[PDB]
Homo-oligomer: 310 residues x 5
């Protein structure tokens, strides 16, 4: 039984994030638990305050016509408990639920450890014989408690795009709203646990540039290579198959080369050193011990720049 | 209370993918959230527009007879919220739900990293005392929003096989429709993260062909073999027990042989070199350093061709 | 309100597997999604066809008395949606649900990778003031679609034991039926991924029988031992704590010995070789390089036979 | 509407384990699926058999007053389906449900692999204006089918403590009953898979007592130490953080010492052997090769005894 | 139908922990199963005891107006079964449920293995046309059975902050209460299983200070480094990405340096020893064998102090 408007019936939305959690880089999802608020004039519900009880009367959901606001990017439909309904005397309705949904917003792992993401919540509304246009009421959209959590992320700002996108879908226009959650990743921990440990094994690798024992230079350079894979693999886990190159995975891969030529050298500073031409061998090893650190720190400036600097 | 047709009652289906996600190579499943649309003539619902309200009247699901459209390849029954119902005056009904199901379609890992998959959704309908034939209405089957996601997959095309398959099941014919989602894998990331890292460890392996120290050639060749397992295992995880040979697992296994004979050689270039016959030993190592890269790059053309080229 | 039979009321069961999945060797469970079909004469429901509507009338579940068929080996009670009810005129009822349960059937890992399992589904029915006997109707028990999946398993045959087991439980006899699903494991993949890789590391281990450097024979034999654990552990994961010896775990353990004595020898071919008695040492190593492969291939025939051949 | 007793209303309980599974050493829980049976005299329900139908009349749960029997050590409230209700003519009620709960009973990992556990199920009942006392009816407490499973455990005996513990909680006495499940662990598999593999690596370790090459005695003793961690870690996984010392973790830790002094020796038999005093060095190594095996087998008798023998 | 108070209606809360479990350091959550108790005067419910039945009358939840007490830090809404309701004659209502919620409270891993945590439960209540103020009744808040478990934690004390925090949220004041659970970690097991095993591998590392073979000093020091990662990684698992430095992760990282300079030395005591200046080399190694243990034990006092001592 929809409210006989005179034109498109505006319905006034607003989300108040209460809990925010389980951001899942792999699945590109996150859990949210907030308030949903809705308002609309249903002139029928109008009531002489004086002749009746008080300012507003409260109804159960069955009694009133209430507009189906579905979310768009959700796994299942959301779990919502209706907190209150409050018809004003002119026929203005105050609806408030407290939903708990798992949201499917995508992420840009381009700068991975140093990435900033923007999450989305959608809310379509499908029209009928009155058109339904959604729109935001920013007094119930300051939705964000001062304790929203979201581990391993700094939460920058929850806001909403005031202009709805009015699609037409299978012959009844829908109205879609864009609620936005902006987040910076907490990259700190990736340093002591990934970046540094990773760099160290790289350096040890190439003390083989001050050694002359092939036997202890393989035992060295090769053993270190292994550990890099333990890290390569460790990272490549908490991270989806991007069809594009992730910054961290760039440098994590640039590295493999520095282990490769490293080997090449130790191998060469050996074929030379045995081809009775140490003249050359200890010239190479002599230089290797300079070229690598440079070309690395160089390539990383190149890389680092190539990603963030662009 | 079914609509007394005069022949098989056609019911007009149509899916509009809204969200698409959690494709699970291991389980061979994916999550989907779309519109389901249905139409049929229920002459009873017919109504003088002029003597009554307007173009169409809307009903709750309980009021109208509505045909049970179950999905076939689903884990549980799907979670669906009814978006709208709209009986036309001739008795034509417009049903629209927004279901959210976890779909069980199988995949062909034959070309694994470079594989293209086709996913399915089925929709049977069980007949009664009127036969029910489903059929597609392609205006509500352009079902695919321009933001369907599906991480790690490029989405080629959502369409449907217009001719239903009319089975007879336990004495009431059912009508089944085939909705098709075609996808190409995003193979890019498998390169910097699996293929390349994997090839590198292989090459280092066989710098042992320019070494002459057994001790540093095992520490070398053996250490590299281990890492290959870290990769072998890494891959063999995000991947079901195919009863058949997966391309990537082919080359991932072809490799083990190149590690084996590698060892064989270093081992031989040692039993020879100590059987006072370096004449031979440094003839073998001499050639090993050519045969392996060739026979590999050769075998890979052979392999690569054997898979994609056929 | 049970149907006043004149003796034990037979209820006619039948399962039609539609989906079959998530077989979990660790938990000894599997997921299933099938039809449940039931029939019984409730003479009360009988109806003059001529004086009434048609062949059969359909009821909602609340209207008719319907016998509680619980499954026995289930985690929670099963999730079932009622597909149809059809009382015949003599009072014969056609019930059809589509349940989706997680089933708890045990497995025999004795021949592990080459094991064949038989899964079970039970269906008790608890009697009241008429005795209830269940029994199978094999026209609704050809339950098995031609697309049942069950990854990593070949599905041999779904059938049922026609004779119910009529227990008496806490004073009301129950009737239990045995539905059986027989499956052979798809052992193929365990070859390129476990068995072979495993054998290789074993062989490399004992090239130490053609080496004479203790230093490169430990670096060798010990390094390989490690990798075997990586495999030992890998396997010991997707596999419950059987109180009995699993074939694969037999040979996976027989192996440890061949690594042990291997060490013993290299260690001995060293205490001898340094006790100025290479006379003996290179006699041992001489034989070791024959005994091991034999005694192995021998023990494996012994083992293999001991398991499958008995 | 409770039954107006004349004193404490006795309610007669009884559990019949049907399925038993997912014992979780880490979480200290287990899943169970059994019958719950209850009896009480509700004189109101009394009925002239002769003037009425038969021996007993059956009711739905809403009709009769039925006593809330909650379980105590449960994660969530239990999932129970009511199997039957049967009021006798004196007003004696026969209630039978089939619940399925996840139970939270603790375990004594003191003798870990060789531990015997006793699990619990509780059933409080909160009184009102008649006191409610629970008590066991041992004819519905032989609850244990002859197929109860519980992988990796031998099930010794399901029984119950006949005397309830009548607490007073927040001013209404409660009555609590103790159902007991006794289980021995199936320790067999821990031998081929943990204990033995673990002892082997220990012995190999100290063939370094018959070697004289520090270089191959470290590559030896150190490589073996690593593998022990692979086992140390493997075990320390399927096992909660006991605030106390687990037998297995005792010997798994005693071991580390035998690796430590082992190293000490090889290290010493080297500082000695190079301080031109092999007089001593090969006196130490000479004895080391006796002391360790003894002091070990000695300490293990000490340990073993200390745990099981006390 | 709310109770027409004369001022803010106080509602009297109280939790009695019955079961406590699944504390999840990674997710920062825990499961709880307790009693919730509520009291309020609803003068309407008042009843002449003499003219009516007895002391108190009991109602079903539907009959009475009952205040919505939502928990705040919960994943989903909590699963609660109503145990009893008991209106006194003045209109005083005794509500008692037994809920089972998964609670989202954060933790301070600063002292990780030796950390003490405080968990929270919240209970808002949203006002209407009478203000609702919650408050604690400490006779139903001694909520904590003498068998609360919580594996791997010693439970210090369950209590509550008597003064509610009265927020105003979207125009209706809410009242929030703070229930507190204080817990000390059971750090014992982390010793035999992490700390000690970890220290051992560190010591062995630097027996390389009494060795002079570079080849056996890398095979030594490098092999031990690997094992430390097996531990580094092991730990870094059961532990969230803190944006801050965890004590255990401090010392677990301080370590890497002692492996690094260790290498440096062995590498140097080799470039020196071969630059025909053993004068120096065996002066360094001479000192290394003192400096490291000191600077370590020193840094650990520094570290240990830095964390716990501040
Ligand atoms: As190694």
């Amino acid at each position: 039984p929809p409210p006989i408007a005179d034109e498109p019936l505006t319905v006034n939305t607003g989300i108040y994030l209460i809990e925010c959690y389980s951001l899942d880089d792999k699945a590109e999802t996150f859990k949210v638990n907030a308030f949903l608020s809705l308002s609309w004039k249903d002139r029928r519900l109008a009531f002489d305050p004086v002749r009746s009880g008080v300012r507003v009367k409260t109804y159960e959901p069955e009694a009133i016509w209430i507009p189906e606001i579905r979310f768009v990017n959700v796994e299942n439909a959301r779990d919502a408990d209706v907190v209150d309904i409050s018809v004003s005397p002119d026929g203005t309705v105050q609806y408030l639920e407290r939903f708990s949904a798992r949201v499917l917003s995508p992420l840009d792992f381009r700068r991975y450890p140093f990435d900033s993401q923007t999450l989305h919540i959608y809310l379509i509304v499908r029209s009928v014989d009155t058109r339904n246009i959604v729109l935001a009421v920013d007094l119930e959209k300051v939705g964000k408690n001062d304790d929203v959590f979201l581990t391993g992320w700094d939460i920058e700002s929850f806001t909403a795009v005031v202009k709805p996108a009015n699609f037409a879908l299978e012959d009844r226009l829908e109205s879609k709203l864009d609620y936005q959650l902006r987040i910076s990743r907490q990259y700190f921990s990736y340093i002591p646990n990934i970046i540094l440990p990773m760099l160290f094994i790289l350096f040890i690798s190439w003390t083989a540039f001050w050694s002359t024992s092939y036997d202890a230079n393989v035992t060295l350079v090769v053993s270190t290579l292994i550990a890099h894979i333990a890290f390569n693999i460790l990272v490549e886990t908490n991270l989806p198959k991007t069809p594009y190159m992730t910054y961290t995975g760039a440098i994590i891969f640039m590295i493999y080369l520095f282990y490769f030529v490293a080997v090449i050298e130790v191998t060469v500073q050996h074929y030379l050193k045995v081809e009775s031409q140490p003249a050359r061998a200890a010239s190479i090893t002599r230089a290797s011990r300079i070229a690598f650190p440079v070309v690395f720190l160089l390539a990383n400036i190149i890389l680092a720049f190539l990603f963030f600097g662009f």
